[PDB]
Amino acid sequence: ISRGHYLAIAADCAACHTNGRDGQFLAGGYAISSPMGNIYSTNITPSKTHGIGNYTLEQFSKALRHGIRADGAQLYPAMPYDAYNRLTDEDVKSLYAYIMTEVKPVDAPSPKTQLPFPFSIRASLGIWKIAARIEGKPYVFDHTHNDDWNRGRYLVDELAHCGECHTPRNFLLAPNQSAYLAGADIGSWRAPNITNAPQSGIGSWSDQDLFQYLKTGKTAHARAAGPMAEAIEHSLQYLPDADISAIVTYLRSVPAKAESGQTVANFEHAGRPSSYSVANANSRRSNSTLTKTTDGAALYEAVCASCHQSDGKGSKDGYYPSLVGNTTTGQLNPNDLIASILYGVDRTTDNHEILMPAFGPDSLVQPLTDEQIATIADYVLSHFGNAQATVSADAVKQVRAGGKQVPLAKLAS
Amino acid sequence: NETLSADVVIIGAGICGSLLAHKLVRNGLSVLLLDAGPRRDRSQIVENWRNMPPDNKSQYDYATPYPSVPWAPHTNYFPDNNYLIVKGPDRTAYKQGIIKGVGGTTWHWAASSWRYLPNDFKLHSTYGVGRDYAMSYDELEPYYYEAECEMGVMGPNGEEITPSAPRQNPWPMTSMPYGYGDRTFTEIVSKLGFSNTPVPQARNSRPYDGRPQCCGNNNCMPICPIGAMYNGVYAAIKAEKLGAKIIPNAVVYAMETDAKNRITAISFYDPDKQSHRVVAKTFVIAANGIETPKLLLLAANDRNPHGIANSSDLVGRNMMDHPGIGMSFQSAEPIWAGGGSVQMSSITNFRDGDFRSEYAATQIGYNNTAQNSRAGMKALSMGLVGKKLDEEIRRRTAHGVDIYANHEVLPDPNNRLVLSKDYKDALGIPHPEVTYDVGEYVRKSAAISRQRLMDIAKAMGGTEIEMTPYFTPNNHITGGTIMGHDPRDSVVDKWLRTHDHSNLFLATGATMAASGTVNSTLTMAALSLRAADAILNDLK
Amino acid sequence: RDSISDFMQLSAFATGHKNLDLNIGSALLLAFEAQKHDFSTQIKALREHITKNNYQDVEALDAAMKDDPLHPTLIQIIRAWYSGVIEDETNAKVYAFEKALMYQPSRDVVVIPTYAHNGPNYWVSEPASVDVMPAF
Ligand SMILES: Cc1cc2nc3c(=O)[nH]c(=O)nc-3n(C[C@H](O)[C@H](O)[C@H](O)COP(=O)(O)OP(=O)(O)OC[C@H]3O[C@@H](n4cnc5c(N)ncnc54)[C@H](O)[C@@H]3O)c2cc1C
Ligand code: HEC
Numbered sequence A: 001i002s003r004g005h006y007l008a009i010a011a012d013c014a015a016c017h018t019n020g021r022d023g024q025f026l027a028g029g030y031a032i033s034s035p036m037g038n039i040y041s042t043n044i045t046p047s048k049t050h051g052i053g054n055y056t057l058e059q060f061s062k063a064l065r066h067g068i069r070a071d072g073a074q075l076y077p078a079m080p081y082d083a084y085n086r087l088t089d090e091d092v093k094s095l096y097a098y099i100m101t102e103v104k105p106v107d108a109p110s111p112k113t114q115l116p117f118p119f120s121i122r123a124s125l126g127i128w129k130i131a132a133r134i135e136g137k138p139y140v141f142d143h144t145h146n147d148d149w150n151r152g153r154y155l156v157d158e159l160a161h162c163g164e165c166h167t168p169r170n171f172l173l174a175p176n177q178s179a180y181l182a183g184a185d186i187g188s189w190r191a192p193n194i195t196n197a198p199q200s201g202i203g204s205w206s207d208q209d210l211f212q213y214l215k216t217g218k219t220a221h222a223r224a225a226g227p228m229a230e231a232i233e234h235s236l237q238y239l240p241d242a243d244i245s246a247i248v249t250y251l252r253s254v255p256a257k258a259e260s261g262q263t264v265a266n267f268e269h270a271g272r273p274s275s276y277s278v279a280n281a282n283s284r285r286s287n288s289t290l291t292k293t294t295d296g297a298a299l300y301e302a303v304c305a306s307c308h309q310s311d312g313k314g315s316k317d318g319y320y321p322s323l324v325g326n327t328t329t330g331q332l333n334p335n336d337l338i339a340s341i342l343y344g345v346d347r348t349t350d351n352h353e354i355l356m357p358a359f360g361p362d363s364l365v366q367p368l369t370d371e372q373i374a375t376i377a378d379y380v381l382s383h384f385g386n387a388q389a390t391v392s393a394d395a396v397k398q399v400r401a402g403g404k405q406v407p408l409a410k411l412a413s
Numbered sequence B: 001n002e003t004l005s006a007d008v009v010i011i012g013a014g015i016c017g018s019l020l021a022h023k024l025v026r027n028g029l030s031v032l033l034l035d036a037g038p039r040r041d042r043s044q045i046v047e048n049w050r051n052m053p054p055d056n057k058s059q060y061d062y063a064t065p066y067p068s069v070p071w072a073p074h075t076n077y078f079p080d081n082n083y084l085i086v087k088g089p090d091r092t093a094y095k096q097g098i099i100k101g102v103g104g105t106t107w108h109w110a111a112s113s114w115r116y117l118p119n120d121f122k123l124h125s126t127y128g129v130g131r132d133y134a135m136s137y138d139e140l141e142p143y144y145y146e147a148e149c150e151m152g153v154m155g156p157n158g159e160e161i162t163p164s165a166p167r168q169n170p171w172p173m174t175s176m177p178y179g180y181g182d183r184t185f186t187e188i189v190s191k192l193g194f195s196n197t198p199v200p201q202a203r204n205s206r207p208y209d210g211r212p213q214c215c216g217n218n219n220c221m222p223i224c225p226i227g228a229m230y231n232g233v234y235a236a237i238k239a240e241k242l243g244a245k246i247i248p249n250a251v252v253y254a255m256e257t258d259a260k261n262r263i264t265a266i267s268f269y270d271p272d273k274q275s276h277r278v279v280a281k282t283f284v285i286a287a288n289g290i291e292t293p294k295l296l297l298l299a300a301n302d303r304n305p306h307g308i309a310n311s312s313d314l315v316g317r318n319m320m321d322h323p324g325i326g327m328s329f330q331s332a333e334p335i336w337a338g339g340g341s342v343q344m345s346s347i348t349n350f351r352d353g354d355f356r357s358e359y360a361a362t363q364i365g366y367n368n369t370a371q372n373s374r375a376g377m378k379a380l381s382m383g384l385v386g387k388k389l390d391e392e393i394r395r396r397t398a399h400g401v402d403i404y405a406n407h408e409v410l411p412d413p414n415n416r417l418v419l420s421k422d423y424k425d426a427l428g429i430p431h432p433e434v435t436y437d438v439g440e441y442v443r444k445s446a447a448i449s450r451q452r453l454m455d456i457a458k459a460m461g462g463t464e465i466e467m468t469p470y471f472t473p474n475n476h477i478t479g480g481t482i483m484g485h486d487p488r489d490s491v492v493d494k495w496l497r498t499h500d501h502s503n504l505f506l507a508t509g510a511t512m513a514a515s516g517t518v519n520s521t522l523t524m525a526a527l528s529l530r531a532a533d534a535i536l537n538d539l540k
Numbered sequence C: 001r002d003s004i005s006d007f008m009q010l011s012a013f014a015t016g017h018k019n020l021d022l023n024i025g026s027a028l029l030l031a032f033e034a035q036k037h038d039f040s041t042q043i044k045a046l047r048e049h050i051t052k053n054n055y056q057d058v059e060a061l062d063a064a065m066k067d068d069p070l071h072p073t074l075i076q077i078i079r080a081w082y083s084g085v086i087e088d089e090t091n092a093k094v095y096a097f098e099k100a101l102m103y104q105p106s107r108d109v110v111v112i113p114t115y116a117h118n119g120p121n122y123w124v125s126e127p128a129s130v131d132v133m134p135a136f
């Protein structure tokens, strides 16, 4: 493929500028759910009327690396232009050539993003950029390290922008470089610690396990879901093996950031040899539409035990993951387990699709309530995952609403 | 309440009613969906089947996991609840199962979604027996495809299986690979001269509609634990998400007709027998081939003394099904039933032919349900202990074979669905009563089918052959409100609208003028979508 | 707990399989005692016969004790462990499904329906031989 096409795949720019499966790609219209509202990605196809067809190289570089449109209006930081701020000039011009040559134009205006006051005016974003300290001298190789480490750092920081989700934000929704890659809460999902910490981060992961997870999202201890599944499916699965190896090499050198209340790695939680009672279920016969089934073990058996086995160790061929020794059930923060139950899993890699059905209110297979989801999650954590984690119905309700509201969003009220 | 007004009101949240409601609410209408039965949870039914006794698993109990409510009871044949009374020489051929609730009897089904042959729509014109449909196969083909895409039907996409229904589009998914039993049966019957071909199933050979791929749980009847197959509760959920109101436990019992014989309102009961009145611009009855004629006959008025839409005296008559002949034996070589769904293939070689002017066309099939429960029960019944018990269980699980042969019955006016004069339910509504006879058509077809089944057993080296001496039901009820062009010889017209009332549609399988050779619910869904088009045309 | 231990050893001898669930065994003992009020005495008599005549396995006990009144109790114990039910009705209590001993001899090939074998297309493989008892 072309160099610009490769850089566009690595930057994952065609995932948020494409409105899902439909919405011919790079036409925009995708609604990113920011804490203040909805931000719509603009038209990117080289249309001379509705797209960026009249963008020069300088204007495209300004939009990509500084968040300024052609007319001078500031771009919302739903653009990772803080991450793209350090792209080399050659990479920027390759991306410009790819946009202006490879992709066909689309003449259809995207929905206008409308944010509540005081976020309505896209002029205070200059103050935000000044406060965030995003500039931003182009990337140069650190000669003290080898080339693989430098390419991995460029991919993680500039192209694949991992820190957009794995680095927590401060009060002003700006990157917190002190807690680099220490995990964050992005909407209803949470990006875990991916530092070199053995117990809290991915330090205890083997190199082959990390490579396999980044290439496919499937590992005996970790399966990608939520934003990670789409990141892998749209961008990471198409990268060369050299790029994934460089990413792993750089990730192994990221300074460790420890969590509070961590003793063992998220994938090192053994399963308690305990389960439900078949006999006790005989009372619940003739009780259609389960509402007297308040037992967590019985609920897991009825809803979850078909695919993940009754002991929670999953299928033998690995299609259904083992909940025992799982990085999602083994996390102290049960956010991702709740999100998995509420929304299921979906990942198309190599034209083959994992799907776990959703079990939220909108489920087609088995709609569960907040209390039932919390009970099942408590059973899973106690018996298969982290025994120190707990789930309440209010936590499930909060995950349903898009996570906890950030303090800054109080200004829009 | 006392108003419950809506643009369209559908009586019955089965697959037909829920699909109709979903299509109607997708097109701007306001829909009120009523169901006599309760709401059901898939996981609760799964728990109920798991705790169902192993003898009820060995012999196919498909109704115990669904509790029967006293106000809207459904049929249970492990110990018989006598809800559906059957009489006649072939009463045993009409003891078929239904489920009442939001989702209906499609809650438990093999999900075999079939298209009828074109000649099945002109049976009388082609062979001189039976009746013709009010519409041709080409008219229902778009609705066939619409139903298949909505439900997600697998199929043998690139394959010249046999003369079958011609397609304009391929199946949404391709049929999943056979298990060991289906491959062995296909080879054996191919050596025997029979064409064993994949069954088109509303199953997931890949993730589809946000639901998982089929992992071969082999419990399609009576409940899928993971949702890798289509249930009408999906259409009900999708319709309710779009604004349709669903009222469970709403047993419709009365209808009011004005001076133009147009339904102005309906009255439905509740578990405490409080009457509620519903007014709408269009009324649809999507209940059953048994419940729809029962409600039509129960709601007789002074304008309609013999029943609603019963001016031709044909409501409840012409009851049809597929009379089957079950058979079980122990194969000489292992078959290992259990890999895949419960019904993965069938012999479709005799679906059509010039013989259909003398005896019925047949469908021969092999049952893919696991034989571990039956093998365990049988080995325990022999008083074996120790290693011999385990060896017997394994051998009978590997060798047990179940075969069936279903036939086509002609629409006979004497196969009726009169209301029972002896039995009533908790609401004082009479129980349904069907007098059933199979006819010389099916009797000759069944002689030939019994010969064929014996041939299949001999080719497999069967032992302990047990062929049922009576005809068995197949649970998809056709006939009762027949369709046609003449108001004096049919109940509904080409668009499933009653000839008596222009305000009433019957989106049910009772409208089909021929039972056909294979399962008949995809035809019911296509007809419901056709009626949806007609209803939208009337109200727009 | 002495009665429960006696029942579990008698069950391990009768079924011939040592790995018997103790909660299923406890429920089975409770239901058997609720059904028969002399069940413990019959268990003690069966164990005394086994330990006195030195029966190597349940085959020898069954062959040498066909006419004794304790044979129905042995057969009932075997059937309750293998099938998970004690009575013979359609509303009988099920004490073991997917852990019942009749689903085990063919478990390596045949599915226990509402629980999944490994993967959505596992059946494209060839099954094992009928003459190989798997495990347990
Ligand atoms: C074991 C089994 C296996 C089957 N296998 C297949 C198969 O392989 N292939 C196939 O094509 N078909 C199969 N069928 C048949 C098919 O799956 C459905 O059962 C049938 O076609 C559903 O018809 P329906 O949607 O019209 O109504 P149903 O789903 O039967 O009932 C619709 C609803 O009507 C409601 N209702 C009834 N009376 C009233 C009233 N007075 N007021 C309000 N609501 C009322 C009920 O509560 C119910 O919810 C099978 C059926 C069974 C039982
Ligand atoms: C870009 C270079 C990367 C890299 C190396 C990783 N991520 Fe993410 N990630 C995101 C979410 C929501 C999750 C949780 C998974 C779940 O919900 O099932 C993850 C998870 C990971 C892991 C696994 C850690 C574990 O203990 O589970 C790893 C190794 C990982 N990521 C690395 C979210 C996102 C993004 C959304 C905006 C983006 C971009 C990335 N991740 C990018 C990367």
Ligand code: HEC
Binding pocket: A218, A221, A222, A223, A224, A225, A300, A303, A304, A305, A306, A307, A308, A318, A319, A320, A321, A326, A327, A328, A329, A337, A340, A341, A345, A347, A353, A354, A355, A356, A357, A359, A376, A380, B212, B226
């Ligand atoms: C009952 C409600 C549950 C619960 C609590 C969980 N599952 Fe599943 N699951 C399925 C698949 C296919 C996957 C992974 C993706 C794949 O490999 O393609 C999962 C994954 C999970 C996780 C996350 C594991 C990880 O490390 O991220 C969790 C916490 C989880 N599940 C819990 C498949 C299915 C099902 C299909 C038959 C069903 C039913 C369930 N899962 C049910 C549940």
Ligand code: HEC
Binding pocket: A008, A011, A012, A013, A014, A015, A016, A017, A032, A039, A040, A041, A042, A043, A044, A052, A060, A063, A064, A069, A074, A075, A076, A077, A078, A079, A080, A095
């Ligand atoms: C899904 C997240 C996302 C990713 C990844 C992303 N963009 Fe955007 N982009 C946006 C959003 C949102 C905006 C507009 C918000 C604003 O107005 O502040 C935007 C604006 C732009 C603009 C300004 C044009 C205009 O009309 O506003 C350009 C140019 C652009 N993106 C190009 C790119 C390129 C090149 C890439 C790398 C392939 C990329 N984007 C990656 C979301 C994304």
Ligand code: F3S
Binding pocket: B203, B213, B214, B215, B216, B217, B218, B219, B220, B223, B224, B225, B226, B227, B228, B229, B340, B341, B342
């Ligand atoms: S039970 Fe479900 S998983 Fe498949 S075999 Fe039947 S559709």
